[PDB]
Design a protein around this ligand. Structure first.
Ligand SMILES: COc1ccc(-c2nc([C@@H](C)Sc3nc(N)cc(N)n3)c(C)s2)cc1OCCNS(C)(=O)=O
Ligand SMILES: COc1ccc(-c2nc([C@@H](C)Sc3nc(N)cc(N)n3)c(C)s2)cc1OCCNS(C)(=O)=O
Ligand SMILES: O=c1ccn([C@@H]2O[C@H](COP(=O)(O)OP(=O)(O)O)[C@@H](O)[C@H]2O)c(=O)[nH]1
Ligand SMILES: O=c1ccn([C@@H]2O[C@H](COP(=O)(O)OP(=O)(O)O)[C@@H](O)[C@H]2O)c(=O)[nH]1
Lengths: 231, 231
């Protein structure tokens, strides 16, 4: 009954800002933030995530698999818990996912493999887990639609300094460009091959979010509302 | 419907010997062989198995987390298969697991952590991963009984050569000595309090497999049948 919409976008694309805006508008609207985001600041996960985040930065080809599996584990666990608890007795329930399990695997896990931070065995193992996981663990999480907060890797680099996380300051431009490339394959050119069948027939809303929208987001919300009404 | 029993014991204790004996004595009885043992001798899982297994020996401090995660997952999957693809409408169906998800954690993963082949984060993430993998996927796997095969480290080292595998050939005796202790404490002495409360209440049969029983096992088997009638 609860519709699941994933908000996809590059680093500092403005996903957290967009969903914070979206959540306030409708009582029937809720949001599952990306678990990794809370790691970048006390649970067992926070400490585990905190440590594994720092280790990841420091030595990626040692910690990509560990980080990536734990990241996706946490996402699934958070998104399931939001499905149960949140949005009780609402008439038109919408759950906005800050990124999805598919961005976990087909963007960030994929990028780390191709940037050699995971060897073949690790990539093969991760995928096998991921594939199996989303059958005997994460069936109810399948998306109804996708909101692609589309922006150039140039725009994204601009917004990284604005938030000021003494770790992301080190993130370069070619990195953004490769993440962007993989977004467009999956979400604009709809190129990317995925083992998930229903994804090829999942509605996608692409929003150009290069122009600042923090105080001017009505046009964006209007599209989302229009997008939702066709689901 | 299906009785689920875990056959436990140190490396080369005789577990595979015993389960293949049990196998041919009844069509109510079926076996779920161990993945890690299956890896040691090739599908997608087996191709991954051999590699991480091979790397696990070359560098335990690098690959223990990765190995323990895939071994447990490949086990959870494998016993799930038998549990849903066997013993249909059988009159007294029993399934004999070669080790369990508890052996994975509290025997092997725990000892690798103790041997500093996993750091705190890897080990805590695994425990986090373990708690949730087994509940949000493997509830139907709860054990109705455990059968402990007890052998000396010397007996095992023997049999390691007898079995042949030069990938495990000169397994240090002291390795066998520590695994032996963790088995003893969990199953016999019962000091090990797991995170699965019911394990402290699950009945345990203990069998001495020091003596060659390959052509003389009727006594052991009689104890199994008596044991099964209690469950
Ligand atoms: C060479 O060292 C690296 C060190 C760290 C990274 C990191 N990527 C990330 C995330 C983008 S991975 C991630 N996975 C998810 N599943 C979700 C999510 N939000 N983030 C870090 C937190 S750290 C990536 C690195 O390299 C990427 C390839 N080389 S590069 C930066 O373009 O010169
Ligand atoms: C130091 O080099 C090692 C090299 C290989 C291992 C291996 N352990 C194993 C298994 C016994 S771990 C295992 N975990 C499972 N979950 C299941 C299973 N069947 N086996 C291998 C297949 S390889 C273990 C190693 O050290 C383990 C600790 N030795 S010690 C003397 O206690 O410090
Ligand atoms: O329309 C926008 C979009 C982004 N930002 C800034 O860009 C940064 C990105 O923040 P956010 O966490 O939302 O990016 P995310 O990683 O979630 O995509 C923040 O400092 C925002 O203040 C902004 O000022 N206006
Ligand atoms: O009573 C026995 C049990 C074991 N074996 C041999 O010891 C080796 C290791 O036994 P097993 O694989 O059953 O031990 P596991 O590791 O499976 O617990 C095998 O080659 C068996 O042929 C034996 O000779 N007599």
């Amino acid at each position: 009954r609860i519709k699941k919409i994933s908000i996809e976008g590059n680093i500092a694309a403005g996903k957290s800002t967009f969903v914070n805006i979206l959540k306030q508008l409708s009582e029937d609207w809720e949001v599952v933030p990306e678990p990794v985001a809370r790691w970048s600041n006390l649970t067992m996960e926070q400490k585990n995530g905190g440590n594994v985040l720092q280790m990841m930065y420091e030595k990626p080809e040692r910690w990509s698999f560990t980080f990536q599996t734990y990241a996706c584990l946490s996402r699934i666990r958070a998104q399931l818990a939001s499905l149960n608890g949140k949005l009780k007795d609402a008439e038109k329930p919408v759950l906005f996912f800050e990124r999805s399990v598919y961005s976990d695997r087909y963007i960030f896990a994929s990028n780390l493999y191709e940037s050699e931070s995971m060897n073949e065995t690790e990539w093969t193992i991760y995928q096998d887990w991921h594939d199996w996981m989303n059958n005997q663990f994460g069936q109810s999480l399948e998306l109804d639609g996708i909101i692609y907060l589309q922006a150039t890797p140039e725009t994204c680099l601009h917004r990284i300094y604005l938030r000021g996380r003494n770790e992301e300051q080190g993130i370069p431009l070619e990195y953004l460009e490769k993440l962007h490339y993989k977004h467009e394959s999956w979400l604009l050119h709809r190129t990317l091959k995925t083992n998930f069948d229903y994804l090829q027939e999942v509605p996608i809303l692409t929003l150009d979010v290069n122009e600042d929208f923090k105080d001017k987001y009505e046009s964006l919300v209007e599209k989302v509302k229009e997008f939702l009404s066709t689901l």
